Amino acid sequence: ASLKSIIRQGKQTRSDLKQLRKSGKVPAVVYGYGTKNVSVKVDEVEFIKVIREVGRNGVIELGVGSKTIKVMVADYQFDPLKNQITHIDFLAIN
Amino acid sequence: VSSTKNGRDSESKRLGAKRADGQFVTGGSILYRQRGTKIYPGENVGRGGDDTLFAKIDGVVKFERKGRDKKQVSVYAVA
Amino acid sequence: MLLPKRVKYRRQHRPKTTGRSKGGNYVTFGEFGLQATTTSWITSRQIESARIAMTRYMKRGGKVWIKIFPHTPYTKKPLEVRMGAGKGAVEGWIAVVKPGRILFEVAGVSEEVAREALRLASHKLPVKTKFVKREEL
Amino acid sequence: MISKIDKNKVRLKRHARVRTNLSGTAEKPRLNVYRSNKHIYAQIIDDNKGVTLAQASSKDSDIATTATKVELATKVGEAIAKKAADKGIKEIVFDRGGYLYHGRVKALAEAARESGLEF
Amino acid sequence: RVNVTLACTECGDRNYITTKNKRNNPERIEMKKYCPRLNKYTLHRET
Amino acid sequence: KFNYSSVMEVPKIDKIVVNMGVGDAVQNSKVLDNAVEELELITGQKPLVTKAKKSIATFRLREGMPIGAKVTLRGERMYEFLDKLISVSLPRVRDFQGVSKKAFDNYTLGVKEQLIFPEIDYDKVSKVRGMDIVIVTTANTDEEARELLANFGMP
RNA sequence: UCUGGUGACUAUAGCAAGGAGGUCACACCUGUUCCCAUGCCGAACACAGAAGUUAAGGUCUUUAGCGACGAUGGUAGCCAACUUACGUUCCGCUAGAGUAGAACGUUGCCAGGC
RNA sequence: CUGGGGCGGUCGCCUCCUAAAAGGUAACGGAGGCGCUCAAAGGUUCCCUAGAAUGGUUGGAAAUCAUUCAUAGAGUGUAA
RNA sequence: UUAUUGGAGGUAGAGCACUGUUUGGACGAGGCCGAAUUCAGACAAACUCCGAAUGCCAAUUAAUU
Secondary structure, three states, X not given: OOEEOOOOOOOOOHHHHHHHHHOOEEEEEEEEOOEEEEEEEEEHHHHHOOOOOOOOOOXXXXXXXXXXXXXXXXXXXXXXXXXXXXXXXXXXXX | OXXXXXXXXOOOOOXXXXXXXXXXXXOOOXXXXXXXOOEEEOOOEEEOOOOEEEEOOOEEEEEEEOOOOOEEEEXXXXX | OOOOOOOOOOOOOOOOOOOOOOOOOOOOOOOEEEEEOOOXXXXXXXXXXXXXXXXXXXXXXXXXXXXXXXOEEEEOOOOOOOOOOOOOOEEEEEOEEOOOOEEEEEEOOOHHHHHHXXXXXXXXXXXXXXXXXXXXX | OOOOOOHHHHHHHHHHHHOOOOOOEOOEOEEEEEEOOOOEEEEEEEOOOOEEOOOEEOOOOOOOOOXXXXXXXXXXXXXXXXXXXXXXXXXXXEOOOOOOOOOHXXXXXXXXXXXXXXX | OEEEEEEOOOOOOOOOEEEEOOOOOOOOOXXXXXXXXXXXXXXXXXX | XXXXXXXXXXXXXXXXXXXXXXXXXXXXXXXHHHHHHHHHHHOOOOOEOOOOOOOOOOOOOOOOOOOOOEOEEOOHHHHHHHHHHHHOOOOOOOOOOOOOXXXXXXXXXXXOOOOOOOOOOOOXXXXXXXXXXXXXXXXXXXXXXXXHHHOOOOO
């Protein structure tokens, strides 16, 4: 129940995302109770390996920058071709 | 010996708006040509026999909303 | 032998073949299914030909689902006559399939048995397919 | 179990339909009349701006008097007539709200007609 | 459906032509039109 | 009586609507007027054009777009009609049932299965005409209506 | 000040529930002599009453169960380029619809008695 | 006129799709109409507002209905 | 020709709220089984609760021409 994210910079061009999705990163967003709209990015293998313990629904400890919040999987855009995630949604469980 | 029976068609009636929004027009100028009440008449705007919107006072055109899902065109005397 | 009971117009305009599948890209009835990876026109003759070859090797030991139905009929002028004389008569019914669209769906059978049955029905289809299973992550 | 229908509801609807091609405008203001099951109220309103400049009711202290339940209307009409006579007593559009023109309203309508109200 | 010519009594001019159904109204049509020369709503009669 | 919180929540009898069924005047030139007078012989009112010949709502044989007669009786005439319905209308019936749904003509589904004008005995009638009388009440419930159907008059 | 009367704003203003009234005023109810009415019934409309009643409409409370309003973040398409040709590819531009989170039980104008 | 000519079929006007969110736009491209009717289907004033399922014509499972939904689902002299 | 702002309109997409088409569940309707309302999921040149990019009309001051 742990994950380290990285605050993404503002205004990302298509090429940027493509290059970011070409490696082992997947753009995500965080929003909910006692928090504002913050855009971050996590690892694909690190997310799938930490989503088999709690399963579909389960409280996780995301390291948004220099803080830890309890969030869950609200939505996730999946690509049928080449079975790869493209976007993840985190909602504050608090 | 194949035959046909679909080579008939009527003429096209130039419909649509005739005056732009914020343009100066003179009384009697046509503002819209439609088949029904696509746009209702506003202030200083009458409806013709063929549902044609025309101005009665010389001023600027103004396309606004009337209700929540109906449009309307009006004209103001202010130059 | 799959065709609509009745249609408003007997002459269409040939469905466009571009972009990716609009919907139906996940198996929701069976456990395994055949996913397309190329774009092409699927006629009713081929659809029923692949279904007969799948049930024949399954020996009525499971349920089969068809997520495609010929909705657009296409015409064809016979005995190659001179061009310009109007549209021809209906020849058959087709169905456009884009990459990421599930074709068939099997259930209530061995996982290795469904992998062989789907492979036999893929030889009667004019599109590259791929064996997939119910996803859940 | 047949249910009853509101009388003010239907009336309001009808009134709105009659207010689609009739409105006051300074020179020609509209004389709205509200008839209840006890008294009747009337006031000259200017739709152009949206402000009243007259008031007359049957529940007024200088109108309240055990009448024949129809004479009050006549007085009401004559009451606002003099009030309207002070300032703006020329061409005016009479509004019958949503009720019929025959009845107490008629008496109130003709009350100003004989008072001098050019309408 | 045939043509109808409303004749005048003073005018003497056919400045009013209308239509009607003989099978429907076989009787003569009598309406009150307006003859400019007389300048008065007179009672016209179909010939 | 049954825990009414006020003296205005007690149910009432809304209206009483009844008249002849088809009385098809397409082949019955004077039977229309005869049935009209028969309806006028129970309560004196002119007969209009509507389907007021049912025991409740509509749930019988279909056709639609007909041309029958109807009568509206809701005041002290309705009370007198109920009195005559307990006198002449229980001379031949003598069978109190119980229901609160539909019958002849959410209704609109039938116009058949009615009575045969029993109080109109062949003492001044030329035929028998279905004149089922629909019951209109301020009943908020069909079983409360059944409680009123046995209340103050034949079950 | 209060409830009313008449307006302006896109239902954030709707429907549903669960409540409390109130009798200033509304309503409800009582009639059919009176003007006036049903394609007939005084149901409605109209006039006269107005004894009783808040039961219903109803005004004020509570609830987001509906309905409507919907941040962001992504991408579908597309404009202009470049490449090989285009069931494209890549680089810039504008960035949807679906959906998440959420907001919503309306704000205003004028006249009177109060 | 014409994917050579002949044979056949068409030749004027009205509505939609093709038509690429202004208007306009072709083919022997795909669908339908008109060659009128109406003395009230006109003018003005006033007032009104389908389908489901239960007292059963052994039942066409829609008589001319009671009042729920109507929420306009209709209706408009005529094709869209 | 740009910049700035205002407006008219239903295409590409997407969607099933209407019209038609469709698949599995589900429909009863007769002394024995057959005309169905919901649940989920699809399709549309002559379907639309929605809806871009471009182009088009205009207005204003600026800036080049």
